[PDB]
Structure formats: structure tokens, C-alpha cells
From a paper:
[name] (gB) refolds between prefusion and postfusion conformations to facilitate herpesvirus entry into host cells. Here we describe stabilization of the prefusion gB ectodomain from herpes simplex virus 1 ([name]-1), determine ectodomain structures at 2.9- to 4.1-Å resolution using cryogenic electron microscopy (cryo-EM) and isolate a prefusion-specific gB-neutralizing antibody termed WS.[name]-1.24. We used structure-based design to identify mutations encoding alterations capable of stabilizing the prefusion conformation of [name]-1 gB and determined both pre- and postfusion gB ectodomain structures. We propose that prefusion [name]-1 gB evades neutralization by most antibodies through an iso-surface display that is coupled to structural plasticity.
We also analysed antibody [name], which has been shown to recognize gB and prevent entry. We determined structures by single-particle cryo-EM of [name] Fab in complex with each of the three versions of stabilized [name]-1 gB that we had designed. When [name] Fab was complexed with gB-Ecto.H516P.L531E.DS, a hybrid/distorted pre-like structure was observed (4.1-Å resolution). In addition, examination of the [name] Fab–gB-Ecto.H516P.L531E.DS ectodomain structure revealed [name] to capture the disulfide-stabilized gB with a displaced C-terminal DII helix, with formation of the DIII helical bundle and with an upward rearrangement of DV, potentially reflecting an intermediate state between pre- and postfusion conformations.
Numbering used by the authors:
A (entry chain I): 2 to 52, 52A, 53 to 82, 82A, 82B, 82C, 83 to 100, 100A, ...
B (entry chain E), D (entry chain G): 110 to 173, 185 to 251, 267 to 459, 512 to 674, 692 to 702
C (entry chain M): 1 to 107
The structure:
């Protein structure tokens, strides 16, 4: 199982950015998905979550509204978008797969990650 | 078994309806399963209450008329009643399509002091002046307001199209009012003098004053009372399975327990944060059951889920997972028995409908759980609690053969009683199930061959030819079984040679 | 928001020792907390879920415990692969938040 | 919960009775046993049906009389009504013990064309001429015939003492007829013109024509319709024990299941071969259960046995034999519970008897499973389905205070509605449980002090002093439980100071 993130790069504050994460090696259609952020040299900090079906979404208060998350099983890709990044938003991002316990539940955790993409 | 009771006709302040048919969960599961702790919530619907006060005046004319209530002006309430505890004699009212003024026993204008009108404190205090004639009355009636707190009703049953939070002192629900501003006033610094002793209150208060064309009302005012949770924690279930079928998740507990059904969609009340108290209580109950029974048995996964199940029940579920045979058939039997019970009770609901129309007193009392008065006001039933009276203050009249109407006399015994031991005595009729009617109207064409019994206290009171004979204990009459347990003596022939 | 703390930020040990780490939440979650570790130059990997359950690959010498708002993770023996960083993650209330973390290095 | 409903009085076409007391198997087994597969049957009793047509004429006189129906001759039905689509004006009838002829609005003899009489198709089409005077009417009513197919009745409720198979064209059940031959005719080659469009049928047919002194009837005739089994496969039981005691074999299944009892003698229906389809269906049932559950568990023995059980049931048993503990007390306890249920339900049947005499509408509807009309025609109940109408086509009148009779006005709200959206509107009264009465007769001596509610759609309609005020949702009225689950809030006092 592996995940691949794309769309990062050095960007000045005051503009939008679009990025996505492709999935492979597992049942992406039957598993939820997470998004995490990590500033340079700092700890981990959650961003958002999308269920396996996509009818329920939750975000972090620091990124609510400013960021959006979307998925598509036909192309096994996780799409995200945002607007007007600030200087504090400079951080490392990854797409994390939720811990699989039952099909009708979301663990609100994660067990698999991808390579990640950096944004500054 | 119980003491006597007096049930005045209900005023319609509180109305009740049937539970209506309930959907039975016909299938006793058997498909895929999932485990988790559960706690169900439902509409709190707690109605606000406030012991308001009612002020009005009675008007009459000595013509061998057209009497009706009249309101009390605000100036009279704060000046004569609030200061001196007296009421004005003159009062204007429409008489045969034209205004006319009344007087106190056709005398000049005078001030009549208010005195208690109950004769003994058995209910709210209440006050009056006299037992053309005019009478001023004041009563500290109770009140109720629906869950939205937009309208309220008093004990008299007259709806008030105005929210109790109305007031221009601060930001409140002042936009909800159907009456004109001339019919409302908010008195600040009100000291609320009492008519029992005229000793004044302990501190000043702001009191709202409103008056409908029929009367005047008032009650202490506060800005708002938003301290209320929308839902109430109804039941806490230790084990509840989450099954999936028919495009609607099913939440079932032990066989005889009630099963819920939802739309499979998470309700947004919790994630919106408007149900913060609901989540707090639900989360506390969820952790309580887990630590109480599943620390090492299961493992909690995810976060609690919420669904607006069928029938309005808000179920809060928390999935669980296990860390790791004769019950199979019996569970199916018990489940089928439970469904039969739900279906049988659903049919019984119909029988209860005609029963209320036939006898609302007994039916309404047993349904609510206590002796309560009731009458059918159409398709909706009215309710009002009854007042109790001890046996010593009740005595049956020697005979119901009213000599005023020979050949047609009362069918049930006439009873005399007193509400309070030191209070005055009253006369009435003995109804069914120790119900003391306040009126005597059970006339019947009394004819020869009469011999009957009537419930009186713990035993019965015998009668024959419309004349009292003696009492009879409970064991003095043979008993039959009007039931069937989970597991007879009748005889004698009639007098054919009459 | 529910906060938590982890201490010490870093510690020096050696193969054959015994160490334990603690994560103290700001409220009584009572059971909803996970743990993670990360090797240098590699993505993190999970350790514990609900403070008690393990997963595949983790050695048997790994086990967590706790209750209320005090939670700990115990490592019964040190090995060359243990010289890494560890973290605690709560999921009792949203948004999800991570702990201060900890680090391990050879003496 | 449901839309409005209009229930016209039943015509007595279909009558219903109770199941009567059922014998409960008091003994919960415990004696010797024997195993075998089982499948029960009962009388098929499928009644034959045919959409017949009734032709008649109404006759009246302009005396400031003695109106009654009149039949239509055969020649006029096939020629004027069918081929031409008109009706004769003159019609003879008895007037005060003597024959007399009528006319079309006291005019000359004329031919009046037929037109639909429903104004919007909500039921059978039906046709008429005009909304001394004579009116010609035609109706394609429905019909039913008892299981023997010897007699039939139409929607109007008038029994026809002649079987639907009557006919002299071929060998049929022509011997059964109580009317004279002059009252019947079989029109051969009838090519059936229709009154809706006069497009005429597709192929010629033979139509029977009979006419009672009250009207004329007809329907397409066929030689015979004997394709019907005397019994119907009711239930298929996987496991059923065969116990022996009391000189009558007992066939019992799972504890909560119903137990049968027979005379221990094989019935001769199967061996006589008349129940060939019964044996085929039964034999298929035994094979289905055997291959489904007992290929290697049990072994068949003999052939299926047939017995006429108590209550009219027919049981087809196939004994089995096996090829090779906590359930003991619970089974006895559950069995006793089932008997208590049967005995309790037996007692409840008496309650239902009094309930129907008190309210046949609601009781008849819940018992059959849907909103249905009903009235007690003595000791037997009549039944007829009701017609539904959407809420949008219904509106309550502003007030029931009929000014024509002051002091005595309607007790329930007066309602106006239209059967079809584009059809004309009608006036009536709002009955109980959303029942739209087609007539207004609920007069009551309306007096001061009135405040009631009435069921309307999903919510309630409020009224005070006989004047509409506003609507009220279901949640606007407090609810109370009327049935006890397998596992309260009432308050307020009356106004004693009135
Ligand atoms: C009826 O009820 C059942 C039981 O509740 C429903 O779910 C099925 O349950 C069976 C039995 O357990 C499942 O069969 C198993 O499924 C697994 C599929 O693997 C998925 O996860 C893999 C990675 O996650 C694992 O590994 C990591 C660590 O590496 C752990 O943290 C995780 O917890 C997991 O162990 C992925 O690679 C893979 O692609 C999958 O996403 C697998 O462990 C087993 O091989 C086994 O097959 C079955 O999959 C469940 N069904 C579904 C659809 O998921 C069942 O759905 C219910 N029926 C209906 C109709 O709803
Ligand atoms: C559960 O599903 C039912 C299906 O009937 C939903 O019913 C809705 O009812 C409203 C009433 O005004 C209609 O406007 C909607 O169109 C109905 N929806 C559908 C999909 O038919 C009901 O609201 C649903 N409940 C929840 C909590 O989602
Ligand atoms: C089972 O036994 C009963 C016993 O009463 C039979 O009852 C018969 O009823 C008819 C009614 O006309 C009488 O003429 C018979 O004399 C009765 N028979 C006896 C033996 O008393 C009943 O018919 C029997 N049923 C079957 C299917 O055999
Ligand atoms: C729960 O069980 C575990 C073992 O599975 C035990 O170590 C722990 O102390 C228990 N926790 C509580 C809070 O009782
Ligand atoms: C029934 O069981 C036997 C063994 O007892 C097996 O050999 C046979 O195939 C089975 N028959 C059928 C029809 O399934």
C-alpha cells in the first residue's frame, strides 16, 4: 500500500493553490481518507477528513473554509483546494489513510501515508 | 384502596391526545451485525411556567342580566388593589348592544376591600369582595407556555397570544404580540402587595401587565429563560446491535427492547454545535457504560454518531469491536412475541378510543397513573387534577327519594361533605369510583323493585326501595376473575315463578 | 479544542534499558487516544489505538495504558530500531490534535 | 399519517363476521412424540367475479310520488341503449295499487341519449340521461358469487337467485334458477356497443340478460369456470411433532405456533383423487422441506397422510425418523404464555363485539387493515371500501354556527371539498379520524363555554365559541402513553373560583 502527493512548491503568501493525492494498492473506494500538515521542524497537525462515501466531512478550525477536500474513486485520487495562503501556512502535507476497523465506521485516525508534498 | 375525590370539570388549560399507532419492527433481525453502545434522546419539550395573577370583575343588573366578566384598568390595579387592596364599584359593559355602567348593589361609588374567596386554602389563594351588583375578583392562577415560549395559557383555559418574555426593558422576545400596545404595560419598581395581609413584598420587581377584553393579567418579568436543552436523555442501553438492511440502519437491543430505524445519514445537530449539552450528556453516558462493562471486552472506535430515527427518537450510537447456543431459537420466539405485543397493543389503541368517549374519567385516570378529571372536547381530551377529601368529611344522605318529584327520584345516593374539616359543608351526589359530583342531576323514573349497591370508601353502601339500609365490606360480595394469569364459583337460579 | 503534553522532549538511552512515555490530555477522554512513531527520513507509522490495541509488525514488547486524561506507552526493552521519535494523538473531540512528542537517542 | 377519506354507507354487497371463540390447546404437550414434515390447508372459498352491468329506469310524478326503479326490456337494451345509445321516455309502474305510465318531464315520447353520471371517473363509469319525470340509468357494477357458484350479488346488494353459469347455449349449470324463463334471455352474437364512445367491441359474444322486477342485468356468458382447487395451501411448517393423547392426534410445531387436533382417521379426499391438486401442492411442499433441511438428517416413511383437523383446517403430514437441555423449562413457560395469549384473546373477542356496535367505522378498518366503511346490519357487519381524496381538495368552513337555527348549531366543523381537482365541489361535515361525511346532521344545542379541537389531516383544527381560529400541529398537544411496553408528565389544576 502506498500513496503519492502532488502539487507542492514554493509559493508566496496571498494566493490560491490546488493539490491532490493519488491512491493505489488497497480498496480506496471502501476506506476513508485523511490530510495532515507539518510545519518545518515542528510537530504534526491535522487538516481534514473525507469518508469512504464522501457524504460527511470535517475540517480543522485553523483551515475551515480556507481549505477544501474532495475525492473521486473512478480515478483513485484525493483532490484538495484552498485560497490565499499565509506565511504560517508553510508546512509539509501528506494524505493519510484511516485505520480500517469496520466498513460503517471512521476511526478518526490513520495507518498509512504517502511521500508527501512541501509548500512554502 | 383510596380516599374520596372531587373532580371539577376541566378548564382546558392542558389538553392530551393518544399516542397513535406505532410502527412495529416486524423482522426479528438475522442479517449482518455490528456492536456498539447506545443512548436515545427525544424532544425535551419542557413548557415554561409562571404563577401569574388574574384580575377581573363581575357585572350584573337587577332586571327580572347579560352578565359577563370585565377587565381591571392598570391604574386601578396599582392604586386601589396594590396600595389599598380595594376595588372600584362602577364598571362599564355592553348591555343589549350598548354600553352601560353598573354599581355596587345599586348604591353610590364605594371601595370594597378584597378577602379570600376559597373559604379554606385547598388550592391557590384567590380573593374577592362579595359572595345591579358588581364584584371584584383576583386570583393567582398557574400558567404554561409551549416549548417555543411564544404563547401561554392560564388555568382558565383562555389562550394569550403573547410570549411571556415580552418586555421593552431590555432585548427580549418583544416582537411576539398580537394585541395592541394599549392593552399592555410593564410596571417597574412593582412592590407586589399581597391581599392576604397587605405587608408588601421584600424587594422591587418589574411586572408585566396585559389585559384582554375579558380580564386583566400580570406576572413577574425577566429578560429571557434560554437555559433549556432541546432534547432529553431518555434511556441508556448497555448493548445495542447495529444491523443493516432495507436501506435504513436498524438499532436493536435485547429481544423485548424497542428497535429504532434511521435514514443512514448523520444528523447535523452535533457537528453544528447547537446540541452541545446533548453531546456532553451522551458522551458521559457512553464512557460510563464502557468503563462499567467493556474496558477489556471491546475497543471503542471512531466517535459517537447521531441519527433522527423513526418516531422522532434521536439515537446516539458509538460503534464497538470485540478484542477477541440455545439462545438462538428462544430469541426468535421472544422477538415474535414482542411484535405480537406491539401489534396487539396497536389494535387495543382503537378500543381505548371509544372507551374515552364512553367514560373519560376512569380511562383518563388510569392512563396517566392517578385519579384525574377529564372530558372529551371533540377529538382532543382535556385534563385537570382532582382534589382529595378524607372519608370523615363525607356522609351519605339517608335517602335519595326526593319528595319534590314523586315517581322520578335520584338514581344514585345524595352525599354531603366539606372540603376542609373546619370549612363549610356542601351537598352533592355520589358518582362512580368514589367520585363526588359537585352537582345533583342523576334523575331516573324510580319504580318498584329497586335494589342496588354503590361504591363508598373501601366497602359498599346498600340500598333498597330508595332508602339506606347498611354498609357492606369488600369481602361481603363474591369476586370473579376478570383476567387470565400466565398459568370459579357461581351458582343460584332465578325466580321463574314470579 | 483539547490539548495535551508529552515529556521529556528527548532522552538518551541504550540497548537493554526500560523506558516509558506519558501523554496527558486536557480533559477526560477516558479511552480515545492513539500513538505513533517515525523513523528519520521516513513517514510516521502507528503504534496504538484506543491506548490498548496493537497492529501488525509492532513487536510484542509494545503496550499502552491509561485512563481519564493520563495515558502512557510502555516499551519493555530497547533495541537498535527504537532510537526514533514518538507521539500521541487524541480523537475524542474534533478537531484532531497531536501531542508534544518525544525523541530517543543512543547515550 | 394519511390523507382524507370519504366513506359512503355500505350497500351490503359483502358481509363479514367474527372468528368466534377459538379452542386453545390447554395442554403444552409432554407425552409421547413422533416427528414429520407438515403443510396445512383450508377451504379455498375463492368467489367468482364478473364486471356485470345493471340497467334500470327511475320513475316519478309531479304530484305535490311513489317513485321506484323500473326494468328495461331486452329489445330496448340491445337496440336503443346499446346500438343507438338512447332510452325510451314512457315507463309503466304501479301507482297506489294500480299501473300507470310516466313521461319525460310530462312531455311526448322521445329518445334521450345517455351520458356519464360520475362527472369524473373515481369509480365505475356509469351512465345516465338527466341529472312526471323518467330517468334512464346504466351501471357497470361489480359482482361476486359464493364458492359453490350457485348465486351471485351485485354492488347494489340485491341477491340474484340465479348462477352466473346459467345458459342454454351448451351443457352448463342451467338447472339452477328461481325466476321464470320470461325474465331471462341469452343474446347471442352480441357485439357490445359502449356508451363512452360507441366504438363497438372487437368480436361478437354471447351475453346473458336477466331482469328482476326492480331492474335489468347482463354480463358476458361462458360455459363454466371450474378451474379452482377446493383447498388452499395456507402454511408450510418445517418441523411439526405428532403427539398422541385423548384419542385424537395432536400436530404441534414450535411453542408459539398453533397446534392442530384430528380424529386420528385418514380423510378420504386424497385417496378419492378429487384433491389431485392438493396432493400435488402438498407433495411438493414435503419434498421442498426435506431436500432443504433433512436429506441426511431424517428419513421419510410411508406416504403423506391427510386429516381433517379441528376448526376446519386440513393437515397433510409426512412422518419422519432420525437417522441417528435448557430448552425444557423455557419451552413449557413459552407454551403456557401462548395459551394465555389465546385465552386472553378469546376474552378480548367479547370486547370487540361491543366496540363494533359503538363505532363500526374505526373498528372495521383496523381489523381488516385499511380505512374501510362499515355499519352493523344486525348481528352481521356490512363492508365497503372508502374513496380517498387529497388534502388540497378539502377546506374547512369558517364557522359551524348556522344562523338558520340560533342556539342549536353543528357540533363538528362543516367541510367543503371536491372529489376530483377539475370536478365540481361538494359540501359536507368533518367526521372523526379524517372521515369526510357526505351529509351534515350533527346538530347540537350549542351554548356558551365551548372550546374544542378536531382531527384535520396531520394536525388539529382549533375552535372557540364556534368559530375557526387557527391550525395546530401534532406536537402542539402533549402526548401520553396508552399502551405498556415490555419494559409521565401531567399537571395543572382546575379553576375552582369560577
Ligand atoms: C457484513 O459484516 C462484515 C463484518 O463486519 C463486513 O465487513 C467485512 O468483514 C470481513 C471480515 O473481517 C472483511 O474481510 C477482511 O477484509 C480486509 C480487507 O483489508 C482492507 O484493509 C487493508 C489494509 O488494512 C489492514 O491492514 C492494516 C495494517 O496493515 C490494519 O491497520 C487495518 O486494520 C487492516 O487490517 C487493505 O490493504 C485492503 O485493500 C482493504 O482495504 C482484510 O484484512 C482481510 O483479507 C479480509 O478479507 C471484509 O473485507 C469486510 N467487507 C468489506 C466490504 O470491507 C461486511 O462488509 C458486511 N457486509 C455488508 C454487505 O455490509
Ligand atoms: C428520511 O427520509 C424521508 C423519506 O421520506 C425524508 O422525508 C422528507 O420529507 C420532507 C417533508 O417536507 C420532504 O420535503 C422530503 O422530500 C422528504 N425526503 C425524501 C428523500 O423523500 C426525511 O426527511 C428523512 N429524514 C432525515 C433525518 O434525513
Ligand atoms: C370427528 O369426530 C366427531 C365426533 O363428534 C364427528 O362428529 C360427527 O358429527 C356429525 C354431525 O352431523 C354426526 O352425524 C356424527 O355422528 C358425528 N360422529 C360421531 C362419531 O360422533 C366428526 O365428524 C369427526 N370428524 C372426522 C373428520 O372424522
Ligand atoms: C483495561 O484492561 C487492560 C487490559 O486489557 C488493563 O491493563 C487496564 O488497566 C484496564 N483499564 C482500566 C481503565 O480499567
Ligand atoms: C444425502 O446425504 C447422503 C449421505 O447420507 C449423500 O450421499 C447424498 O448425496 C445426499 N443426497 C442429496 C440428494 O443431496
Amino acid at each position: 500500500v502506498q500513496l503519492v502527493e502532488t502539487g507542492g512548491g514554493v509559493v508566496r503568501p496571498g494566493r490560491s493553490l490546488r493539490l491532490s493525492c493519488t491512491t493505489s494498492g488497497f480498496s480506496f473506494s471502501g476506506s476513508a481518507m485523511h490530510w495532515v500538515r507539518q510545519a518545518p521542524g515542528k510537530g504534526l497537525e491535522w487538516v481534514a477528513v473525507i469518508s469512504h462515501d464522501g457524504n460527511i466531512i470535517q475540517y480543522h478550525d485553523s483551515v475551515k473554509g480556507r481549505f477544501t477536500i474532495s475525492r473521486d474513486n473512478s480515478k483513485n485520487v484525493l483532490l484538495l483546494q484552498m485560497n490565499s495562503l499565509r506565511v504560517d501556512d508553510t508546512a509539509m502535507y501528506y494524505c493519510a489513510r484511516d485505520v480500517w476497523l469496520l466498513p460503517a465506521t471512521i476511526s478518526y485516525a490513520f495507518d498509512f501515508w504517502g511521500q508527501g508534498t512541501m509548500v512554502t | 384502596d383510596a380516599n374520596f375525590y372531587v373532580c371539577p370539570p376541566p378548564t382546558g388549560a392542558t389538553v392530551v391526545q393518544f399516542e397513535q399507532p406505532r410502527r412495529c419492527p416486524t423482522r426479528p433481525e438475522g442479517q449482518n451485525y455490528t456492536e456498539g453502545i447506545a443512548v436515545v434522546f427525544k424532544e425535551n419539550i419542557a413548557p415554561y411556567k409562571f404563577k401569574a395573577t388574574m384580575y377581573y370583575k363581575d357585572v350584573t343588573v337587577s332586571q327580572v342580566i347579560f352578565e359577563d366578566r370585565a377587565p381591571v384598568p392598570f391604574e386601578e390595579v396599582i392604586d386601589k388593589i396594590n396600595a389599598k387592596g380595594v376595588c372600584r364599584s362602577t364598571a362599564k359593559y355592553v348591555r343589549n348592544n350598548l354600553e352601560t355602567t353598573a354599581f355596587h348593589r345599586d348604591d353610590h361609588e364605594t371601595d370594597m376591600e378584597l378577602k379570600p374567596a376559597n373559604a379554606c386554602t385547598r388550592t391557590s389563594r384567590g380573593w374577592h369582595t362579595t359572595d345591579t351588583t358588581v364584584n371584584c375578583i383576583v386570583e393567582e392562577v398557574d400558567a404554561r407556555s409551549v416549548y417555543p415560549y411564544d404563547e401561554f395559557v392560564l388555568a382558565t383555559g383562555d389562550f394569550v397570544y403573547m410570549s411571556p418574555f415580552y418586555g421593552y426593558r431590555e432585548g427580549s422576545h418583544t416582537e411576539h404580540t398580537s394585541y395592541a400596545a394599549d392593552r399592555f404595560k410593564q410596571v417597574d419598581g412593582f412592590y407586589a402587595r399581597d391581599l392576604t395581609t397587605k405587608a408588601r413584598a421584600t424587594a422591587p420587581t418589574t411586572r408585566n401587565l396585559l389585559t384582554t377584553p375579558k380580564f386583566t393579567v400580570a406576572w413577574d418579568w425577566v429578560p429571557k429563560r434560554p437555559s433549556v436543552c432541546t432534547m432529553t436523555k431518555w434511556q441508556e442501553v448497555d448493548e445495542m446491535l447495529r444491523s443493516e438492511y432495507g436501506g435504513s440502519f436498524r438499532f436493536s437491543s435485547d429481544a423485548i427492547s424497542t428497535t429504532f430505524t434511521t435514514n443512514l445519514t448523520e444528523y447535523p445537530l452535533s457537528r453544528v454545535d447547537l446540541g452541545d449539552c446533548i453531546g456532553k450528556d451522551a458522551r458521559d453516558a457512553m464512557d460510563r457504560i464502557f468503563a462499567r462493562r467493556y474496558n477489556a471486552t471491546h475497543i471503542k472506535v471512531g466517535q459517537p454518531q447521531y441519527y433522527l430515527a423513526n418516531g422522532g427518537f434521536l439515537i446516539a450510537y458509538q460503534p464497538l469491536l470485540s478484542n477477541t447456543h440455545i439462545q438462538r431459537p428462544v430469541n426468535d420466539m421472544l422477538g415474535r412475541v414482542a411484535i405480537a405485543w406491539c401489534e396487539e397493543q396497536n389494535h387495543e389503541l382503537t378500543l381505548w378510543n371509544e372507551a374515552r368517549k364512553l367514560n373519560p374519567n376512569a380511562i383518563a385516570s388510569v392512563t396517566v397513573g392517578r385519579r384525574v378529571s377529564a372530558r372529551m372536547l371533540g377529538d382532543v381530551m382535556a385534563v385537570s387534577t382532582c382534589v382529595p377529601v378524607a372519608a370523615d368529611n363525607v356522609i351519605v344522605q339517608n335517602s335519595m327519594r326526593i319528595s319534590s318529584r314523586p315517581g322520578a327520584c335520584y338514581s344514585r345516593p345524595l352525599v354531603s361533605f366539606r372540603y376542609c374539616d373546619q370549612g363549610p359543608l356542601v351537598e352533592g351526589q355520589l358518582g362512580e369510583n368514589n367520585e363526588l359530583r359537585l352537582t345533583r342531576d342523576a334523575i331516573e323514573p324510580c319504580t318498584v323493585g329497586h335494589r342496588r349497591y354503590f361504591t363508598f370508601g373501601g366497602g359498599y353502601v346498600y340500598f333498597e326501595e330508595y332508602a339506606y339500609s347498611h354498609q357492606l365490606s369488600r369481602a361481603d360480595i363474591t369476586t370473579v376473575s376478570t383476567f387470565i394469569d400466565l398459568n370459579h364459583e357461581i351458582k343460584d337460579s332465578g325466580l321463574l315463578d314470579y | 479544542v483539547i490539548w495535551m503534553t508529552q515529556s521529556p522532549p528527548s532522552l538518551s538511552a541504550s540497548i537493554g534499558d526500560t523506558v516509558t512515555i506519558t501523554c496527558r490530555a486536557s480533559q477526560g477522554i477516558s479511552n480515545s487516544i492513539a500513538w505513533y512513531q517515525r523513523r528519520p527520513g521516513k513517514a510516521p507509522e502507528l503504534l496504538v489505538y484506543a491506548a490498548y490495541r496493537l497492529q501488525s509488525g509492532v513487536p510484542s514488547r509494545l503496550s499502552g495504558s491509561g485512563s481519564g486524561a493520563e495515558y502512557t506507552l510502555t516499551i519493555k526493552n530497547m533495541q537498535p530500531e527504537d532510537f526514533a521519535t514518538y507521539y500521541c494523538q487524541q480523537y475524542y473531540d474534533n478537531p484532531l490534535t497531536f501531542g508534544g512528542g518525544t525523541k530517543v537517542e543512543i547515550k
